[PDB]
Every structure is written in structure tokens, then in C-alpha cells.
Design a protein around this ligand. Structure first.
Ligand code: 7DE
Ligand code: MG
Ligand code: ZN
Length: 323
């Protein structure tokens, strides 16, 4: 109600508590936060999208995330979308992207885990699930999330890119596909090397504004920018990071419980009788989150310093939660 408005004063800030907005939106953060972002960047105006259209798409999209799934529900889509919108406002990337590119980034972030079943690519491959067979075991869920996001834009009343050029809509679909595929954890390490080499060639202007040559350079930053938004939980306030931990931990144990019935080998971080939730978070920050965010901060320094502090802080709170 009036509390929703209060929370959207932080739409442009990293400090947005998305759990709160979900509460003041009839349990619909992704719609809310998507509407709120597009209005804020005038994307509805710049791209001839009717609110009527945009709302019905987002609602249908949002209803396609499983609400009975602990982490990969509509709330997480809403959060990557909002994070990506903050990251896109980072000073070291000012006016570096076209609005077409900006529009592709956020939309990507929003459909990026759509219709996620609560289990891993590995589980679906090992169980011979229909999705694995449909997708020949390569970036399975990521391919799917994309398939669904775009299948909904085919229904006339739902196509939000309907008033986009044919050239532009194609450039979009190509950028969006590229980005969602980049959120596959198995491509993480190679994608980290790509960001590292790019940082060693970091060219800018006098104003601490990076210079990107063509597509290759601009879609790589956007690739990694979404990837970091997806792995942004350990850089948020402590109060929101633990809520996110409990949510992913609960999805992972429930995956463990399905792996046990089946008598498949359980994946240690998915084992609810052996796994330290605390150790799981420390390693995730040491081997995955920090190396990424260190390189991102290097790319945009000093824009991400505040974020790196909080990362190394939360990290040590979790270290302390161990005997
Ligand atoms: C908040 C703690 O996060 C986790 O420990 C954790 C681990 C491990 N993997 N992931 C994870 C799982 C599926 C997909 C992604 N990612 O693609 O965003 C990340 C998370 C959120
Ligand atoms: Mg995903
Ligand atoms: Zn995700």
C-alpha cells in the first residue's frame, strides 16, 4: 500500500529489500519490480510498449515460476532484474549501452529461471528427464527458460516487442539467448577467464568510462553483468543474504531427498544429514562469488568497492558461525 511506495524509493539502489516489495504487491514481485523498472528507464515509452501488454506478459511470466519451489521462484527473477538495473547504472558504464541492449539485459534477467523445477541440470540429466532428452544434456534448464520466455511472446495480446523493428527484435533475441545461456554454472569458470583478459585490456576515457569496441565486447560485459546479478545474494545486506541462503539450502536438501528415494549418489551440498550450511556459504564466496566480484570491481573500480566490503564482511560472519 503506502509501504510499497516507500520501498520503491530504493528501486535504483543495491539496498532494495525485495522480500518487502513482494509483501506489498499481492505476492507478485516480478510484475511490480518489472513495471517499476521500465517506468524508471522510460522503456515503455522508448519502445512503444503498452502497459496493458507489458502487465499481462509479466503476470503470465510470473505465474510460470513455481511458487512451491524454495529459491527459483518469481522472487529471485524479480531480484536479478532489479540488481541488473542497478549494475547497468554503474558509473564506469555510463551511456555505453544502447537502450535496445539495456532492454535485453533486464528482460533476460526476468525470464532467466522461468519454469525452473527446483532441481539441477545434473539431476535432470541423470534421471533421463524429458527436458534432458529434449535438449541433449547441454545447458538444459537455461535453454528451457529461454524457450518458455519467448513462447509467451508469440500470443498476440502478450508480445511486448510487437512494435520493435524486425532488425532490432532479432538483435534482441540474439542478445537475450546469449545471456541466459551464460547463467549456466558449468560455463562459469571459462566466463571468468574471459572477464579477466578483458580487464587486462581495459580501455576507458579520462572520465573513468570504459570504451567498448563492438558487440563482442558489449555483450560480454552484459553476459557477466547478468551472471553477477544471479550470484549477487552474498553481496547484499546480511539480513537479505541469510534469507537467500535458507531458500537455496532448502531447495538443495529437497533435491537431496529425491536423490535418496531414487538411490542415486547424493551431492554433498545437497545432503541434509552432513552439510554445514555455514561452510557451504564460505566456500561459495571463496571459490565462486569473490573471484567474480573482484574481477568485476577491477573492471569498474571504484564503483563496486562498497559491494566488495559487504561481501568480505558477510563471508566472515559465516566463518564465525562455525565452531
Ligand atoms: C546464497 C547461497 O547460494 C548458494 O549457495 C548457491 C550455490 C552453491 N549455487 N547457487 C546457484 C544455484 C543455481 C544456479 C545459480 N546461478 O545460476 O545463479 C547459483 C547458489 C544460489
Ligand atoms: Mg538459472
Ligand atoms: Zn538464477
Amino acid at each position: 500500500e503506502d509501504h510499497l511506495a516507500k520501498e520503491l524509493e530504493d528501486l535504483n539502489k543495491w539496498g532494495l529489500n525485495i522480500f518487502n516489495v513482494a509483501g506489498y504487491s499481492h505476492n507478485r514481485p516480478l510484475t511490480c519490480i518489472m513495471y517499476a523498472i521500465f517506468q524508471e528507464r522510460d522503456l515503455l515509452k522508448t519502445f512503444r510498449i503498452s502497459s496493458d501488454t507489458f502487465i499481462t506478459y509479466m503476470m503470465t511470466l510470473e505465474d510460470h515460476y513455481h511458487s512451491d519451489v524454495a529459491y527459483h521462484n518469481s522472487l529471485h527473477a524479480a531480484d536479478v532484474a532489479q540488481s541488473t538495473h542497478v549494475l547497468l547504472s554503474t558509473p564506469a558504464l555510463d551511456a555505453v549501452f544502447t537502450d535496445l541492449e539495456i532492454l535485453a539485459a533486464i528482460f533476460a534477467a526476468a525470464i532467466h529461471d522461468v519454469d525452473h523445477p527446483g532441481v539441477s541440470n545434473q539431476f535432470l540429466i541423470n534421471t533421463n528427464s524429458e527436458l534432458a532428452l529434449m535438449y541433449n544434456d547441454e545447458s538444459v534448464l537455461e535453454n528451457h527458460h529461454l524457450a518458455v520466455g519467448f513462447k509467451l511472446l508469440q500470443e498476440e495480446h502478450c508480445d511486448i516487442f510487437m512494435n520493435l523493428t524486425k532488425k532490432q527484435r532479432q538483435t534482441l533475441r540474439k542478445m537475450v539467448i546469449d545471456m541466459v545461456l551464460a547463467t549456466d554454472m558449468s560455463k562459469h569458470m571459462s566466463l571468468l577467464a574471459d572477464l579477466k583478459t578483458m580487464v587486462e585490456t581495459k580501455k576507458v576515457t579520462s572520465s573513468g568510462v570504459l570504451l567498448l569496441d563492438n558487440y563482442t565486447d558489449r555483450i560480454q560485459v552484459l553476459r557477466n553483468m547478468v551472471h553477477c546479478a544471479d550470484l549477487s545474494n552474498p553481496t547484499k545486506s546480511l539480513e537479505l543474504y541469510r534469507q537467500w541462503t535458507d531458500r537455496i539450502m532448502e531447495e538443495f536438501f529437497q533435491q537431496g531427498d529425491k536423490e535418496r528415494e531414487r538411490g542415486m549418489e547424493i551431492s554433498p551440498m545437497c545432503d541434509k544429514h552432513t552439510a554445514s550450511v555455514e561452510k557451504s556459504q564460505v566456500g561459495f564466496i571463496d571459490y565462486i562469488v569473490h573471484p567474480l566480484w573482484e574481477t568485476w570491481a577491477d573492471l569498474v573500480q571504484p564503483d563496486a568497492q562498497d559491494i566488495l566490503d559487504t561481501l568480505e564482511d558477510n563471508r566472515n560472519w559465516y566463518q564465525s558461525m562455525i565452531p
